[PDB]
C-alpha cells in the first residue's frame, strides 16, 4: 500500500514538507 | 515521528526493509 487515505495524507503532507 | 496501526505497519516494514 504505497498510499491509503490516512497513509496518503501523512505520506504526502509529511514528505511534501520535507521535500 | 508518526505511526498508526496501518501506518505503523508500513512505516516499520517498508522502512525496515529499506534500512
Curated annotation (Swiss-Prot), chains A, B:
It comes from Human immunodeficiency virus type 1 group M subtype B (isolate NY5). Homodimer; the homodimer further multimerizes as homohexamers or homopentamers. Interacts with host NUP98. Interacts with host PPIA/CYPA; this interaction stabilizes the capsid. Interacts with host NUP153. Interacts with host PDZD8; this interaction stabilizes the capsid. Interacts with host TRIM5; this interaction destabilizes the capsid. Interacts with host CPSF6. Interacts with host NONO; the interaction is weak. Forms the conical core that encapsulates the genomic RNA-nucleocapsid complex in the virion. Most core are conical, with only 7% tubular. The core is constituted by capsid protein hexamer subunits. The core is disassembled soon after virion entry. The capsid promotes immune invasion by cloaking viral DNA from CGAS detection. Host restriction factors such as TRIM5-alpha or TRIMCyp bind retroviral capsids and cause premature capsid disassembly, leading to blocks in reverse transcription. Capsid restriction by TRIM5 is one of the factors which restricts HIV-1 to the human species. Phosphorylated possibly by host MAPK1; this phosphorylation is necessary for Pin1-mediated virion uncoating. This is Capsid protein p24. It is found in: Virion. The gene is gag. Changing residue 2 to A: Retains infectivity.
Amino acid at each position: 500500500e504505497q498510499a491509503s487515505q490516512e497513509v496518503k495524507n501523512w505520506m504526502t503532507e509529511t514528505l511534501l514538507v520535507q521535500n
